[PDB]
């Protein structure tokens, strides 16, 4: 069962086994479809990491927010052969063809992190990034 933690109502963390991520939302396109790995099914994620725990935690998170792997848009991760390190990126922009998915993602996030305010506003480019982090000392362990 993964642990979820919100610090200062703005910084989001998740931990499961030997993996922990910080989750953030802003307009920086770290990954692009022409350079990085496209993820449509959980098994595509073997190219995202050499760590099975990182892969499992990523899949758990996406399932928990209500990502439908079959129907919903694909997301991106950095190829494990690159030196920059593990990261996945989801387009949660509340705009155009993405609006339905973005609204669902927002609902999922509100269920997982009650006290996080929605930074993905109407029309704005908003890309969720999940990256490795040390588990903060101010977060709990159970």
């Amino acid at each position: 069962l993964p642990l979820l933690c919100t610090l200062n109502k703005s910084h989001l963390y998740i931990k499961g086994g030997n993996a922990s991520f910080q989750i953030s939302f802003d307009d920086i396109a770290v990954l692009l479809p022409q350079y990085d790995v496209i993820i449509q099914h959980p098994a595509d994620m073997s190219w995202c990491s050499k760590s099975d725990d990182q892969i499992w935690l990523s899949q758990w998170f996406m399932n928990a927010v209500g990502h439908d792997w079959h129907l919903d848009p694909p997301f991106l991760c950095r190829n494990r052969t690159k030196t920059e390190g593990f990261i996945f990126q989801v387009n949660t922009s509340k705009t155009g063809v993405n609006e339905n998915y973005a609204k669902k993602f927002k609902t999922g996030m509100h269920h997982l992190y009650r006290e996080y305010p929605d930074s993905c506003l109407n029309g704005k480019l908003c890309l969720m990034k999940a990256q490795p982090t040390s588990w903060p000392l101010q977060c709990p362990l159970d």
Partner: antibody
Amino acid sequence: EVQLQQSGTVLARPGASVKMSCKASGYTFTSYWMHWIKQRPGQGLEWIGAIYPGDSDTKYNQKFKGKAKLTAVTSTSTAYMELSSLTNEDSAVYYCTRRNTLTGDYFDYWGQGTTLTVSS
Amino acid sequence: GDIVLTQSPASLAVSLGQRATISCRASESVDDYGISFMNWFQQKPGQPPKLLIYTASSQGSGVPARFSGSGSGTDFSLNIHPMEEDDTAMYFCQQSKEVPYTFGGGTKLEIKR
């Protein structure tokens, strides 16, 4: 081809207000934050703030709250900055610049600069 | 709270054909997402700053290969080699990790004679 065309040199008296403009072309004006930068004669660069013309969202450097007001007219792809309660410290070159977020956060295109001279 | 960038040297003179190296140190890390949010600009008199390098090491549009950015965390460098006449300018580093965006104090590059 991306171009940012700023308004001409402006002279203002101490205590007055001034509004300067930055006309954008060659890209979708409502898809990018437009930032404003101050450069005093022979000095470095200081960040003022930014506007997102797509929804009128604004951000300010704490140092310029109450000094600068940023607006936009999307029908003409023009960003505006109003400076109030002018003093000698406001005499400077002011730049507008487009922020890009593709694999970074960077000011990729810049206006040519507007000189403000505050004098009696 | 604001990130402070310290450039060195304040000025330098380099012979044509030789190497110019400019350093920028940040008061805290500008890394996130596996990349470094540090950019470099060139400014000539009467002209706006021109983006040379973004995200520490990516080449700006049309920027010659003689300009090279490196570094991560808090320590970054711009190298120019070989120095050409048209490279005389002010050079500024800038962090884009946190608002307010902040710039280094500038380094003036001159031709040695």
